[PDB]
């Protein structure tokens, strides 16, 4: 199951970069730290808290309309 975790972490950091979050040096540095931590982790529970931590960064912005994107 951790494979899905790492894959979605990869995609999430990809979309974060394409949202030009890199223009904030410290924010991008922390996100890169979180990504490198997830891919190197070996236990599944730590991965979940790290990925939600770095997803909070995405959800704090206003450049991705979540309600339209959550079409179910």
């Amino acid at each position: 199951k951790m494979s899905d975790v790492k894959c979605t972490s990869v995609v999430l950091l990809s979309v974060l970069q394409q949202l030009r979050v890199e223009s904030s040096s410290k924010l991008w540095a922390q996100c890169v730290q979180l990504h490198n931590d997830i891919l190197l982790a070996k236990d599944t529970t730590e991965a979940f808290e790290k990925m939600v931590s770095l997803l909070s960064v995405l959800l704090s912005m206003q450049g991705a309309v979540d309600i339209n994107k959550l079409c179910e």
């Binding site: 770095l54 704090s60 979540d66 959550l70």
Partner: peptide, 15 residues
């Protein structure tokens, strides 16, 4: 948090 964000709740920093 995804439901909280879709309705009204988003943090202002990394959790």
């Amino acid at each position: 948090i995804i439901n909280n964000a879709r309705d009204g709740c988003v943090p202002l920093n990394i959790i």
